[PDB]
Amino acid sequence: METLHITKTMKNIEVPETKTASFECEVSHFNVPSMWLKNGVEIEMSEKFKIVVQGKLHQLIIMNTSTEDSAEYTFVCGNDQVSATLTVT
Ligand SMILES: [Ca+2]
Ligand SMILES: [Ca+2]
Ligand SMILES: [Ca+2]
């Protein structure tokens, strides 16, 4: 029928320091866990990183960006994973 897979990939993004950035990923199925990675390290929800789901849409909101947040961000689902880069300023 249908594999559990990523249906729409993420986009590279640049924002000025201290502003908010985001990444979005769309997947095939509902109730998928939001497996977000920063340089391969699992991201935990905090005051800074917001992990948001709307049905098949998954979004990482990165608030109060600093230079250090310039990284590769990854979404994992099925046997897929997609990545994009954040450049801060
Ligand atoms: Ca600066
Ligand atoms: Ca800085
Ligand atoms: Ca997997």
**Distance between Cα 61 and ligand 2 center (Å):** 19
**Distance between Cα 69 and ligand 1 center (Å):** 12
Contact predicate 4/78, CB 8 Å: yes
**What's the resolution in A?**
2.0
30 DSSP 8-state letter: S
**Distance between Cα 69 and ligand 2 center (Å):** 10
Which residues 6+ apart lie within 8 Å of 74 measured at CB?
A: 36, 37, 38, 40, 81, 82, 83
**Distance between Cα 89 and ligand 3 center (Å):** 32
Residue 72's domain spans which residues? 1-89
**E strands, the chain, where?**
6-8, 13-15, 21-27, 35-38, 41-42, 49-54, 57-62, 71-77, 80-88
Element (H, E) at 48: none
Report how far residue 69's alpha carbon sits from residue 64's, in angstroms, rounded to the nearest whole number.
9
- The CATH number of whichever domain residue 38 belongs to comes to 2.60.40.10
Domain count across the chain: 1
